[PDB]
Amino acid sequence: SGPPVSELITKAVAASKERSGVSLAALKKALAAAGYDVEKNNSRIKLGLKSLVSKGTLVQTKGTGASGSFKLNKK
Amino acid sequence: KPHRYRPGTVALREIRRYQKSTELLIRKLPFQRLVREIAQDFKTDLRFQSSAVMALQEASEAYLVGLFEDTNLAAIHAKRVTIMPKDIQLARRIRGE
Amino acid sequence: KPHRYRPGTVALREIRRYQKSTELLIRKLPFQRLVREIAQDFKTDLRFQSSAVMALQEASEAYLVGLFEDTNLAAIHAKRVTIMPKDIQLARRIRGE
Amino acid sequence: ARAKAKTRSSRAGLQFPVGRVHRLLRKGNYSERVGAGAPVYLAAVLEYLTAEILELAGNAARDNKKTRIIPRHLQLAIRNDEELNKLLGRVTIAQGGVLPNIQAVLLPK
Amino acid sequence: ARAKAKTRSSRAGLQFPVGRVHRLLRKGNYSERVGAGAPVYLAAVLEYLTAEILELAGNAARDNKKTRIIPRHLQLAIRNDEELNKLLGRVTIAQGGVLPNIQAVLLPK
Amino acid sequence: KRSRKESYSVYVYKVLKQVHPDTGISSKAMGIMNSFVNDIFERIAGEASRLAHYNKRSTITSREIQTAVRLLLPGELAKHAVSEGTKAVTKYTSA
Amino acid sequence: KRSRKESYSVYVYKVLKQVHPDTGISSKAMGIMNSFVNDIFERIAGEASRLAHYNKRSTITSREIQTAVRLLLPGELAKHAVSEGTKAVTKYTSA
Amino acid sequence: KVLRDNIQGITKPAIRRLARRGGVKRISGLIYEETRGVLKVFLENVIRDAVTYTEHAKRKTVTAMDVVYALKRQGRTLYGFGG
Amino acid sequence: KVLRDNIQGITKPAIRRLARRGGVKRISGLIYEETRGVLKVFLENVIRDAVTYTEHAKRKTVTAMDVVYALKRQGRTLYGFGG
DNA sequence: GGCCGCCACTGGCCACTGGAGAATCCCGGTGCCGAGGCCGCTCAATTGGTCGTAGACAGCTCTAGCACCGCTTAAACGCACGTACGCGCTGTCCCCCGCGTTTTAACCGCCAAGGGGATTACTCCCTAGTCTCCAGGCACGTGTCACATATATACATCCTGTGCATGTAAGTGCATG
DNA sequence: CATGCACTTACATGCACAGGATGTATATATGTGACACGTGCCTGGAGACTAGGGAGTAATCCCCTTGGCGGTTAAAACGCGGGGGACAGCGCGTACGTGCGTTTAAGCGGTGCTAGAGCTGTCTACGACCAATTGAGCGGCCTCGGCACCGGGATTCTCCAGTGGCCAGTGGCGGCC
């Protein structure tokens, strides 16, 4: 079981802290390295990242929706 | 609730049907009209054997169909399932036309 | 730093050169060796006019070069600049090879 | 004092007319002289080819449980042989239809 | 005692050999008789085609400042004419090269 | 009545009964086989004429017919056509 | 001792000097022209032969050649060739 | 006497039928007029030759045998109408 | 005498040269062997034809006339070799 | 006492599945019209001989290819470092087939009419063929200048450092809480 | 005193421009062989003349093609809609591009040989030509049974509604600080 994928996405984006936001591909590779069945849960990842965007805790840099780059808010 | 098939299912059944079929798909007399219309552009008031019209219909449908398999190959080669006129232009340019 | 062209610039210059040039793009002696290699498989002790081998040459680059413009048309159709062997396969099959 | 007029197709054990094909070659203007065995060889080659295409046609008609051969069966036979299709790729049969062929990407999941 | 020799090419007023083309058509086995005007007409057609393609090759050579016709000049002359290209879409030329031609997407920016 | 028009109905019917005594034939398919045999015949005649011209041969004989059928027919079709024609040539040679 | 071989050299060179008196030629380009003029010669000749067969005529006339030109040569070259060949035939008729 | 618009007689559903015979699953809306133009080109290319044959045959009636001659001229030989 | 893999005698940079004459910008690494097989098929077909001409000619040596006859048999006519 | 982390309750979402509906395949049945078999005709395959020649071989020749060898760089290979390009993913918007309805003209099918395809006859224009004679084009030899090659400038153009237009964020003086 | 804010000011990013470097053009010098041009010849093409025969032309007729008229419905067209697909954006990892160093092997000159292409004489096998003849194959007829169309049931496919599992949102409580 464990925690839901939202917290895992938060450590996935917080692992790098590049100038550009993390891609969908890079966070998928990060969840693959940390361990997740990403092949079964692409829609789960998309809804989790979009939900985190809607809270304003994450801000999308260049892409729209689930594409492009994703970086943390100001605080 | 009135049934509605999901898109392309009827199209695939059409593909199976008309691959199974052998008959001409063109309306015969409009084809004759167009053949005579092109004919008078070369020589007016000519007569036609109906066999000549049927032969032109067969050859025309065959050339068109082979063009469409080439177009289908180009479209799937472009990783698409919808054919485009640019696909046809590509196919004709490959064929040397 | 030393001089270094960006990718494609040398490719453009050599494209302009070889389109401008007419000279053979195959080393002649291994080509002749391959011709004798293939021909021995069909009949033994075959001898060649050098002119015959040369005509076999310009036929070879003719067929190959035309195949690559077909491939390039497929690639620009496929929104790419890098050709892949399935593009050549598409060109052959649409030509009917 | 003539002997019985025997036929050259029977002399070669063949079905196709040796005399008619020889006449066609003499009047088709391919050379002014024709070697005697050449139309025999040609008729044998044609008989062989017709034998295989008719055999495949009868096989296809039997596959479609049909007792009388069909131009559809001719198309299905001529296209499903690799060497025959390579022989006759540019040639179309009237009312032949097409091969049943759907690309895998066209097929649904 | 005999009329002086006068060529049939001059009788047409043409340069291409009427007698040579006549002999080639007779020995080329296309019909057992041939009309008198047919080889004259044929030689006239070939002379016209040769003259026009030689004009085009001359323009191609003059554009590249060369006095003599080159197979590159022939390739450029034929491939840049859509009429002659459709005449010769399946014809290859020794040491001819191709048209200088690039796709626009292959160009930078 | 009218003038006689040449056809290949009887020979193809005999060959059909050689390969399939049981089955029938449609007349439009018969026209197809006539077109087929005429097309192949004129092809082979053309390359025979060309090859006889290349060797400057006034007489068309069986050897370049063999050459032409090996040239056009792909692979095992060509080899078995050579075999059948060679057999028939030997039998007619033996009258 | 050598056997004489046929070429189109004198005719192509003279028509070149007619169309361009100042223009030379390379010899392998002349070989290409030899192949071209020969190739079109058998194209028109084969068309004339089969057209003579189709109307069952054993004599190929200028009408057959002109028909073959309209077949193989497309568009403007066909009609220009027809006009010049008609002029040549008319001049031969006066000859 | 004259004819002005019969190229539109090759209707869109007929082209759809041909495409389903061609194995095309999905057809754009821009296809049909371009196929009409392509068909027009092919038909005029064969029928100009057919008119040439028929006039060279001194006939005013178009025969199918000339259509066979024209089609086999352009490398598109058809079986089922020879003779 | 006996030759083994002269198909690789067509070097990869020669294939790049042929592609640049065709105006090809970028070439995959998978291309060269596949094109070697394709040209192998092409050469074996035309040399089968040219050979068949040659033993019919009762000659041991291939002539260029046989080659150009083979190419015009395939609708790939080449000019400039005495045809 | 408050706040956060963890455990539990709960609703939403995704896939699995069964069943209904519809298109299709399969099964006789039956009238009907091409298939095929018979029959009468005719023309062309045969049969036989002859004459003239087409090509196969003997022999001979010279020539082009085949191999060897020996230098001699050009490029092929190979490695390395970097960008840019296939390509994978997703968001989004719109395009086109499914389906139902309306119209419409295509098609059967029927009938009139006449036109030219085709067939037969007739007579003749041409042309294939033969012999004579002769000049045209090709082999042969030669010479000579258009072009190949080399080399030195001259510009084009492409990459790159960098100089200016624009976004950003922080420091701090000042007004005021 | 303190503190936040706003204004000012330094920092950073991207676009634009000058400048170098190298590749390509381009201008001048030099040989050379390839193209072009005079020459002998013989051989292929023109000249004269004929036979006859394929082809042009007249006549006809009938069959095929065109023209037209009514019914009916399949066929096309039109509209709604709603899902699936095209496609743009974005990024990423990699796989060729480019560049530099090496090996080698491609290439050129020169030697030598002989299979082998190819020419020439013979002459003989073979095939075209020609007269009779017939029987095989083609035109026409007629019957039938295979099969196209029709009608009925089973089957299969599909699509969507019902259902359970899976996951995340939410609440509540204990424990520690």
Residue numbers in the entry:
A (entry chain U): 35 to 109
B (entry chain E), C (entry chain A): 37 to 133
D (entry chain C), E (entry chain G): 10 to 118
F (entry chain D), G (entry chain H): 30 to 124
H (entry chain F), I (entry chain B): 20 to 102
Copy out sentences from the published article reporting this entry, exactly as the authors wrote them:
H1 is absent from the stacked nucleosomes of the 4×177 array, but is present on nucleosome 1 in the 4×187 and 4×197 arrays, and is present on both stacked nucleosomes in the 4×207 array. H1 that is bound to nucleosome 1 always contacts entering linker DNA via its helix α3, whereas H1 on nucleosome 3 uses α3 to contact exiting linker DNA. In all ten focused-refined maps, H1 shows three DNA contacts, similar to what has been described. The H1 loop L3 and the N-terminal part of helix α2 contact nucleosomal DNA near the dyad, helix α3 binds one linker DNA and loop L1 contacts the other linker DNA. In summary, as the NRL increases, nucleosome 2 moves farther away from the stacked nucleosomes and the trajectories of linker DNA at nucleosomes 1 and 3 progressively approach canonical values (Δβ = ~0). As a consequence, H1 can contact linker DNA, explaining H1 binding to stacked nucleosomes in arrays with longer NRLs. We show that, with increasing NRL, the linker DNA emerging from the stacked nucleosomes is more relaxed and permits stable H1 binding.
